[PDB]
Amino acid sequence: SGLTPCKESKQFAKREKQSIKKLESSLKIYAADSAPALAINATIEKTKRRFDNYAKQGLLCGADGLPHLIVSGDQRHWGEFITPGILFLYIAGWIGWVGRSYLIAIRDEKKPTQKEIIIDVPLASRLVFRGFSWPIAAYRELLNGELVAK
Template sequence: MASTVTFTPSGLVSPLKALASSKSSFTGAHSTRGGLTAVVASKARVSCAASEQKSGIEGSGKQIATALALAAVLSTAPLAFPQNASADIAGLTPCKDSKAFAKREEKEIKKLAKRLDKYAPDSAPALAINATIEKTKRRFDFYGSHGLLCGADGLPHLIVDGDQAHLGEFVYPGILFLYIAGWIGWVGRSYLIAIKDSKKPAEKEIIIDVPLASRLAWRGFIWPLAAISELRNGKLIEDAANITVSPR
């Protein structure tokens, strides 16, 4: 009669046959599998909820980005189309459409025409008054054709808020003024530095060295670049040790 051989694999505490016949072990294994199933289901629900939350956040993020892009486009619309911007700025209207502006032009021309009646047509005063009338007409026509805005007094008002439709009223002239003022100051500074080491610097401040001043004036047209270069080299600002301080 063949003997029954019980095979116990390495790593297992009890034989496979005993494990199959053990109800308690089967019940424990079943409960363990149930626990694993519950854990897997719980993880699946958490993963599903997390993915739904992530997709919701991404959707809201896309909506916010779309709203910001739309707001940026709407905010730059007046800059892209400055001619279509509303002319009603602080109660102002285009001079060409202003009744007060037209009335002021008519009043000035009538005043000049009344003076013209006192002189002969070919006299020098009459010619001068006619020239003034033409200048007045050109001035008012210039104000009306260049988009200037007038108030209730009929006078043009300058817009200085950086609107592209009105840059020529203040921004461009302001930049030109700063450039010219800086050029004058830079040339004067360069002249004083150039004569500092001469024999009679005080005399050259009174009696200008014209050839030297002319050369410096031509060089001064690039004063913004020269100022930046000297600032980088440390030559633009004098050291505090070289500045004299009066006693206190």
């Protein structure tokens, strides 16, 4: 954390300033009441909103003038890494768990490959929401998690 918060970084302010002037420059050729003008003014308003949020959410900045992320585990920045991540692992786990629920449903059947190239959508729709409680995979792990043959 050898950095300075973005709220109080001159370089971070110079970037917002320089960016807006560039978009405003383009604003000149199109005159006022105009489609491009409204499009550029919308980018400018989207630009201000962006920088505003970064400062607002206490993100440090580097001498470069750009925010940098802390992933150490520090509590002030869970938003930077840890919070989104857990969110990921939830979804990743969801997808994988549902995907594995399908293969087991498919495995003891006729031609199993037939449903791997042509999806059983009724079956899939039945199993998709099981991923919602996928971290109760843990309780499968206490018993039938993985194969004993290997």
